[PDB]
Structure 1
Amino acid sequence: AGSAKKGATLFKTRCLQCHTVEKGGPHKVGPNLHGIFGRHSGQAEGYSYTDANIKKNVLWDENNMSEYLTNPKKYIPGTKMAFGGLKKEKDRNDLITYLKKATE
């Protein structure tokens, strides 16, 4: 079982620079992530995505989010998300446990 509290710290240190999670939170370098799970990639209104992210056209879930976060440019070549990857499966599980609740 992932640990959301550890996930929240991982989000703060690794993601928060570029992303907010709450409903009505602002777009920053990256898009606000409210409602990300169960939505197709590249669909947050008011954000200018790469065609790479739009045409990947993946329905985000816990599993493909983990694949993506391992290595974003591998999963979506051409993406403008400048993030190398979360190496540790436990860190991905914790982060995603947090993100599923925080973006709900």
Structure 2
Amino acid sequence: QDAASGEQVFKQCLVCHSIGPGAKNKVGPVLNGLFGRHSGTIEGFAYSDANKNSGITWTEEVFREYIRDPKAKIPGTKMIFAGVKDEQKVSDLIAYIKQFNADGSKK
């Protein structure tokens, strides 16, 4: 869907997460090159066991179920965030995050 719209959705994430060039870890891990990556593997971040040992691989499908209700998909996770319930927002959110390569550069 719409990346430009996803950027506005991402603003709730921006508080804890960084994306794009020069992104660094904050309260949450950097989200550059998220899709396809295994959960709990961004270097330098202190993940909870819940996240680190979950065995999840981030695909669009799994990401959509997770962002809807984080604590439901990863009980005990440190990401105390309510989640994004809107079907359209999630699709735009995905479109926005997918533009980035692991190094922050735009595809």
Q: TM-score range by the shorter chain?
A: over 0.9
How far 1:22 moved relative to its partner?
2.2
Deviation beyond 6 Å, 4+ runs, structure 1: none
Q: Secondary structure at the match of 1:66?
A: helix
1:25-104 → structure 2 map (5 Å cutoff): 25-103=23-101
Is the Cα contact below 8 Å between 2:67 and 2:84 reproduced in 1? yes
1:15-26 → structure 2 map (5 Å cutoff): 15-26=13-24
CA distance in 1, matches of 2:55, 2:101: 20
Identity of aligned residues (%): 47
Aligned twin of 2:5: 6
> 1:56–1:39: structure 2 CA closer, same or farther, 3 Å change rule?
same
Count residues with an aligned counterpart: 102
> 1:31–1:65: structure 2 CA closer, same or farther, 3 Å change rule?
same
More helix by share: 1
Structure 2: segments with no counterpart, 5+ residues: 103-107
Structure 1: segments with no counterpart, 5+ residues: none
Give me the CA root mean square deviation.
1.2
TM-score (norm 1): 0.92
